[PDB]
Symmetry: D3
Subunit: 179 residues, 6 copies
């Protein structure tokens, strides 16, 4: 069983996070550069998710949602939900998003899941302090991850520009109006 943070400040968790390192999900592009997530609090309390990465020089992105697995619990156990393929978004896919650690200043976080398949180390700065990085990697070991093949995500000196306003660019609203 995993130790997930309790009492996450959702408002404060919003904004931009850079992926410092990750065991990417199956469909997350594997040799991404400048990978980042933008989180926005929706009016109903769920979270809008914009994940972005640069694959061989081109921005790719996916829009989705995150929400509490059990609203009555104080554990930071979320689910993320996407509609795929992006160009025909009719298949809902979900997965576990557990905040294993976050510092008091909400500057870096360790994201994991009970399967120990995937893992992300996030930072408000694209260039993370090295001792802090090692501490979060060690925290992943405490939770039973094998961090042997964990490689850092390349981050440019300056972050590339993009539109990160919350949007449904693929038209999921139309598919949902059907039902």
């Amino acid at each position: 069983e995993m130790e997930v943070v309790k009492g996450l400040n959702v408002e404060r968790y919003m904004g931009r996070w850079y992926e410092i390192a990750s065991f990417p999900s199956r469909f997350q592009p594997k040799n991404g550069v400048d990978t980042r997530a933008t989180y926005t609090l929706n009016p109903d309390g769920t979270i809008h998710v914009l994940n972005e990465t640069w694959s061989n020089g081109k921005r790719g992105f996916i829009e989705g949602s995150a929400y509490k697995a059990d609203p009555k619990s104080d554990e930071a156990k979320l689910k993320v939900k996407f509609y795929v393929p992006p160009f025909l978004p009719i298949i809902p896919v979900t997965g576990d998003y557990w905040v294993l650690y976050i510092d008091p200043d909400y500057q870096h976080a360790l994201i994991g899941q009970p399967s120990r398949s995937y893992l992300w180390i996030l930072s408000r700065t694209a260039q993370m302090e090295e001792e802090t990085y090692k501490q979060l990697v060690e925290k992943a070991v405490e939770e039973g991850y094998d961090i042997s093949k964990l490689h850092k995500t390349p981050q440019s000196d300056t972050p590339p520009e993009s539109n990160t306003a919350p949007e449904d660019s693929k038209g999921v609203w139309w598919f949902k109006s059907l039902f």
Copy 2:
């Protein structure tokens, strides 16, 4: 039979209109916030239509066209035409867009259709003067609408930003190049 405005100044009707209230079409998201339309005059005299709304914090939009149902008539009876689903835009859908009323300054308008199914009250300002709102609602009653369940569309204090340049973002041009 409905009294539609005659001799609409199409050039002057272009630009941004906020939806103050509406009996939304079946696929227009029902609890939209900050709903607006942007109209642009195309070189061939048809109208490019960008409708936008914010559903639970996310921008959703559709691009389409409007044109005169009978070009030889001076009645403001338009058709709107969209290709749906937005993510596979192969089905053309059309409907009636009748300007039932517009003021001399082109600042607010009542849009309806002979089926009396759907209705929109539009304004150049997101915050419409209350007596003017009541007058346009009364004009809808004169045309036989039941305005009992008509609710105002929530509008933020400041309008959210978006790209409203005229675009074919889903690739309808490719589908039309086929034929």
Copy 3:
């Protein structure tokens, strides 16, 4: 056999090119205005391609790639590759992109292919000097094109604005993650 330029400076060829005139490909919209291409050098040495045109007042675009047909050759024989339809990008299509001529200052170019089906005259300025235009048309005749029905692409006095950062807006990354 065609005389293709040798030793193209790929870095220098990048950036924005306006289409002055063209025998458009089958799916390139035929009565385009303000047609332009933006080329960006990818980290792996291939070229990101953004082609844009305005069809009846609306921006339409396609994102693709260009690369050397034979990397060991010094001939500017490229292939362009797109995934179509844009709204369901599962079909890879390729074609020949041969730089038949470019001036020492990289200010205008003649693009063709051995089939003599399609042809593009490109310029860093949307308004090309008339004697230079005639010279490139004559160069196409030297390569066996019939330039009788070649019409110039209309270009506005000022170029319309668009986002030309390199992007995969349709989600090809997801389709490629599958394989």
Copy 4:
């Protein structure tokens, strides 16, 4: 208001019906030959619908469902439900299917709807007796249809063969397993 038959014997209504004449729905092929419906009672009491027609020599078909609009009512007011397009069956469409008349022997029937848009005269025999045909046309007039442009559906001397076992050939089961 329409006079719909009461107390329809659903079991007895099952089987094959030939379309003798019809004001076809928008997507029902318009110059069909040998048009027929096959109805089968499903275990849950709904009706499986297979409609077939021959368009220029080729069998086309659609599979769908019919069920009672109000189960507590004894009026033969059904809804039919299809998932379209057949090759991407993600859009549910429904419409009214009202049995306006059926003879005691369940040998011919008049199908209509309150919109008076569409109409079908059905027969267990592809070759319907002429006086019986005229009587059912007159029954449609009693319900307010304009039968002026009603043309008989061509029926061959012998009915073409097809597989009419109840099937989900397009894979709707997979789309429904998602939800």
Copy 5:
């Protein structure tokens, strides 16, 4: 670790198998009746798979493939592979198909997988002898399955008719010709 049968006679395993009971996969319809699989040996030694079930009176099916996870091994560890959705078969999905037990006469079999998620008891007869059924359920317990909620698949007295010749009815051949 699971005890899988060794030295399966693939030729002899071919033909029709009825599903007597199952913990159905996520997309296998859950309240199926008359569920069966037909296996055919392909020229290259892989196995063509046709799974069929009747959901509320309608035949639904999927075509796929099975093959050896490790050809050099004598363990009956197969993978099954399908392209989904059936109506747009562009997503390859695979899963484990392990023959946990088969009797010397190839008349009944227990199919499972190391995840212990899904389970099938198969029989050449739709009506399986009760003591034999209990023995195979016990064999599943030996492999660590919780058989508490295992319900038998309803099987009609006579099997429904269908076309079980090996076919690619959805056009996967076209998608594969692309690559």
Copy 6:
């Protein structure tokens, strides 16, 4: 220029033809076995086309149409037309189908096209007499084909069974009802 047969007896050309050998089109499966075409005369004089082949033990097929390139000409220059992909048949593709030779008894034929890209030798019998085969190959050489890599299509001793009644199994009728 090619010598195409004049005055083809279309009625007599209908029925089943086995492909004895072929330079397959790009999307025709390349290692097909038991490849055959079935042609049926439609009421409007066009030809329904069912092509079938067995790829690694599974039937794959495509339905399309053939018609006269110039109805006023007596040359057997046809076009074939298909809608692809079969599972989303929205793209019309056409190509040339020229009968280069047919014997007086309508028992074997040579099909080609001016591009000399593709070629088919057809026979009413799956097992073609060897001297007749050589004569038709020589006829292809007379028309400028390089027959060096031409391999015979494997044909079983007995032809596999299939449904060859004329059908629109993918629902093209629905896509065409739209327009």
